[PDB]
Symmetry: D2
Subunit: 150 residues, 4 copies
């Protein structure tokens, strides 16, 4: 299923993002002078199941979670540098049941153990000065699709 | 290369759409009550190399061409019905050198002999009440990419 | 539909190879010092709808057609000039209704106007010293599948 | 990278099968009355990093590991219960660093925690009466490739 997720907005998923689900987020642009950009996978109750804070100025990408009116837990970080590929950078998130796998353009995957046992009903996108385009293209799969030879 | 083509607007291609090029246009929605929707492949000089007029009310899809200040030539038509697949209908255009191949979700391809020997520098999207989303996602390939088993 | 086509053998297609059909042939190797290698798309009646003779020595690729017990028609040749990318070279054939499109790893697409109005029911592979592996992996589609962004 | 893995044989990988690596195994047939079929991911030192024993009779799939001249470790089994889609069944194995992900045509992904900290250098295929074709088509990726919208 294809969605167009606009900045400082979100998209309500047709079906819940759950185990086996794959979300391929792709930007039509890369604004090198952009600021902190965030993507949140939210449950129906608006709990932040997966928070991805891309911070170029801090050279880090922070992952976390928290209930709608709860507090962030410990942060999980990785260097920002050498992760995205202009002019069409991408973010791929896969739900492996007990944890999410996040993959950017380069480098190894990031694995984030789930902290809230719920499926995502929406994906939000927030940024004052986004690093990516608005909207960003999002393809959500119920399961990993057949793969091309390359 | 990924582009976000908004309705009643266009996208300037990074490189020209020419022989071997493949443009995959995908909508995030299908507005059954939408009207006539158009996609034009334009040259640098703004000549309409390939005009695709999707007319639900007339139950037809019209293909044509014309110079920037020229006249349409003869029309090439196909029934509108059973061509698109909601909620993510698509249009795939392939430049075969001497003609374009246009493929929708269902049915056989449409072949349109080129009438203007030029490459496209832009793709335009026009509609009063579009049948598709705004923007529509557009992936342009320099050549047919590797194919998945299905 | 996946088939394993062995050298000096053939594979019977579960479905007619006809307009919109795509055959993605892939080899697990490239035998540098290989000799003339042939791929034929045959009708159920064993007419050779599309003959592809890749000749390293003569440095040409000959395309032709012929009825079961008939003689070869006029040849349509092009220079061989390094069309394959080792170690996994590919040959993709697409049925466009009035003609076939043949794409290798390099060079431009080759177009061959159909000479016999029949669909292919089998693909044959012949060679004394094949340029490719035995068997070759063959994925046949009834229509062009959705494409990855790259 | 494409390989043709023959039954009761193996294929030496041009590159280490390691974190981020994906092995897409595809069969050109499904032998209904086939017997126990095995696929092993081996280290260059011939340690069995991941053993996959598909047993129709016992109706289970056993996953295990073992050093070259060592004994099998504790078994991790699941019911076989119709995991393959004829006539072209598939097995996809992904290296996630601390564990392997194995996906069949049906059922959920199977996760197997790594028991040996080595990368795979070869994939073996064993069976007296294989459930699948010989050889099986194997596409190995260094990283998950861009995905088609479907
Ligand atoms: C190393 C460390 O622990 N630094 C902490 C920052 O990462 C925290 O920032 C907040 O982090 C959460 C995720 O854990 C989320 O990304 C918040 O949006 C983020 O807060 C924003 O960004 C900060 C840099 C501040 O400008 C803040 O005002 C913003 O609202 C902060 C706050 O929890 O604590 C640091 O110790
Ligand atoms: C069967 C036939 O020939 N009908 C003709 C219409 O198809 C023409 O419409 C115009 O067609 C061109 C492509 O050839 C292009 O799609 C134009 O946008 C389209 O004109 C618009 O749509 C028409 C239905 C009218 O409402 C017109 O005012 C719009 O501007 C017309 C006009 O060339 O002629 C018919 O004969
Ligand atoms: C310059 C020229 O026209 N050369 C002709 C060859 O191309 C012909 O070869 C045959 O070509 C058909 C397709 O047209 C098919 O590829 C046959 O396998 C091929 O014949 C074989 O290869 C030849 C090189 C000879 O060794 C022949 O004995 C084999 O049977 C030939 C024959 O039609 O004529 C040439 O003039
Ligand atoms: C209930 C139980 O634990 N069953 C055990 C079998 O699963 C074992 O079979 C061997 O299992 C390993 C992986 O753990 C591998 O699949 C071996 O090929 C397999 O041994 C073969 O198949 C068996 C069914 C026997 O026919 C045996 O002779 C073969 O060599 C066996 C042996 O470890 O123990 C069972 O208890």
């Amino acid at each position: 299923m294809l969605y167009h997720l606009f900045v400082n907005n979100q998209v309500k998923l047709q079906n819940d993002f759950k185990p086996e689900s794959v979300a391929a987020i792709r930007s039509s642009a890369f604004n090198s002078k952009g600021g902190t950009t965030v993507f949140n996978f939210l449950s129906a109750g608006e709990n932040i199941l997966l928070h991805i804070s891309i911070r170029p100025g801090e050279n880090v990408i922070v992952f976390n979670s928290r209930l709608k009116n709860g507090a962030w837990g410990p942060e999980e970080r990785i260097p920002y540098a050498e992760k995205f590929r202009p002019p069409n950078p991408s973010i791929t998130v896969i739900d492996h049941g007990d944890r999410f796998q996040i993959r950017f353009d380069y480098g190894t995957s990031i694995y984030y153990n789930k902290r809230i046992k719920e499926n995502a009903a929406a994906i939000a996108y927030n940024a004052e000065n986004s690093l990516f385009s608005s909207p960003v293209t999002v393809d959500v799969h119920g399961l990993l699709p057949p793969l091309p030879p390359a």
